[PDB]
Amino acid sequence: DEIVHFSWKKGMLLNNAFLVIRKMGDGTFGRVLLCQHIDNKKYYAVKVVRNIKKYTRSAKIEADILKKIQNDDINNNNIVKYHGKFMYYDHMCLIFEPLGPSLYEIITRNNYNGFHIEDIKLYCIEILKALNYLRKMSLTHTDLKPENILLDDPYFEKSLITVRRVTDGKKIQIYRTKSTGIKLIDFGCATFKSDYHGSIINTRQYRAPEVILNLGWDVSSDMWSFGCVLAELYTGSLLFRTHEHMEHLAMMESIIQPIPKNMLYEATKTNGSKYVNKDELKLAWPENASSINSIKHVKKCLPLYKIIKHELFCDFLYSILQIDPTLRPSPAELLKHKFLE
Numbered sequence: 001d002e003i004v005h006f007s008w009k010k011g012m013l014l015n016n017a018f019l020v021i022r023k024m025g026d027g028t029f030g031r032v033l034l035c036q037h038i039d040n041k042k043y044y045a046v047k048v049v050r051n052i053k054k055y056t057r058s059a060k061i062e063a064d065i066l067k068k069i070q071n072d073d074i075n076n077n078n079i080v081k082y083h084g085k086f087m088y089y090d091h092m093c094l095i096f097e098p099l100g101p102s103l104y105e106i107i108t109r110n111n112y113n114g115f116h117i118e119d120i121k122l123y124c125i126e127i128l129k130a131l132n133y134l135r136k137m138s139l140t141h142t143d144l145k146p147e148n149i150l151l152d153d154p155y156f157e158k159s160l161i162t163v164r165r166v167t168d169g170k171k172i173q174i175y176r177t178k179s180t181g182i183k184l185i186d187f188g189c190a191t192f193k194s195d196y197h198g199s200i201i202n203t204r205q206y207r208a209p210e211v212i213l214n215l216g217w218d219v220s221s222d223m224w225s226f227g228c229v230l231a232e233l234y235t236g237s238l239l240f241r242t243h244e245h246m247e248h249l250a251m252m253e254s255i256i257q258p259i260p261k262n263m264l265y266e267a268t269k270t271n272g273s274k275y276v277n278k279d280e281l282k283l284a285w286p287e288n289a290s291s292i293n294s295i296k297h298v299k300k301c302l303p304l305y306k307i308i309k310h311e312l313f314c315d316f317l318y319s320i321l322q323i324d325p326t327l328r329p330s331p332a333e334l335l336k337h338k339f340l341e
């Protein structure tokens with residue numbers, strides 16, 4: 001529950017500097033409050049991490065990672081501006097720039113309809129600037145999702161526009177934002193090239209095939225998540241609506257492409273073994289399904305080209321959503337794609 005988070009009140013004075021105004025959002029580890037500094041009058045987003053000692057330790061690592069990637073670009077290379085940290089008694093507090101709602105929240109306000117394709121193009125360019133920078137810093141975010149991409153404008157300036165819905169061609173109204181600038185947040189699980197690599201990364205629905213199949217992962221795993229984000233920005237819904245790995249894997253074959261024979265072979269030697277039919281070198285589907293509903297769910301999955309009506313964006317998305325991680329393009333290469341010109 002969200003009651004587990006830091007107890008606050010309007011008019012609170014944190015560390016003899018920050019005046020609490022309101023709550024901006026909650027995670028599972030931290031509560032983010034909008035604060036005004038009493039010395040400079042500037043506004044900040046203060047993330048108050050929970051009392052627990054293990055979350056304090058990870059927040060320190062998060063602070064450390066954030067500090068390393070702060071730069072002098074105009075838009076901070078589309079990475080959330082981090083200004084420093086302090087302790088409020090037992091609480092770790094991280095100081096950020098104040099940002100607007102997530103791209104997910106905007107989807108929610110738009111009735112889970114996708115953004116207009118013109119706006120998708122611009123969000124895409126801006127997210128890629130951030131990913132290209134992280135690549136140059138040898139950093140894998142590991143938690144790319146529309147919830148972790150915030151609108152640069154904290155005032156959320158928008159107006160209603162008319163769009164033909166992608167599914168049926170029905171004329172509907174959605175919100176277009178004035179600003180198209182974005183910032184990446186939530187660098188807690190972020191991993192440098194030289195650092196330790198965990199077995200499971202990503203939010204389940206944005207998880208890369210090589211992570212699920214336990215084949216080892218690198219910075220190219222972020223690229224798979226990015227493709228899921230983009231599909232969601234277009235349709236307003238998750239590309240992979242699932243809660244278990246086996247179903248998730250079978251969905252990948254129905255929507256994108258069959259899993260490369262070499263990857264299924266390398267999976268038999270790892271913890272991805274339980275997903276592979278060793279003899280036939282194929283997915284253990286529908287053998288290892290959990291119910292008939294799970295099978296009907298995977299059967300109901302349309303291939304990507306039926307979902308993505310735009311031709312250049314479809315080609316763009318297939319480039320990204322490559323099951324083989326070695327075949328995925330880098331952010332630098334994607335910025336040269338015809339769709340973004």
Ligand SMILES: Nc1ncnc2c1ncn2[C@@H]1O[C@H](COP(=O)(O)OP(=O)(O)NP(=O)(O)O)[C@@H](O)[C@H]1O
Nearest residue numbers: 024025026027028029030032045096097098099186
């Ligand atoms: N700079 C910011 N400006 C405005 N809102 C923010 C900002 N940073 C975070 N938030 C909001 O606070 C929520 C939690 O931020 P986050 O850094 O993800 O917290 P966390 O608990 O450490 N990680 P997670 O458990 O994965 O959410 C986000 O989902 C946003 O809604």
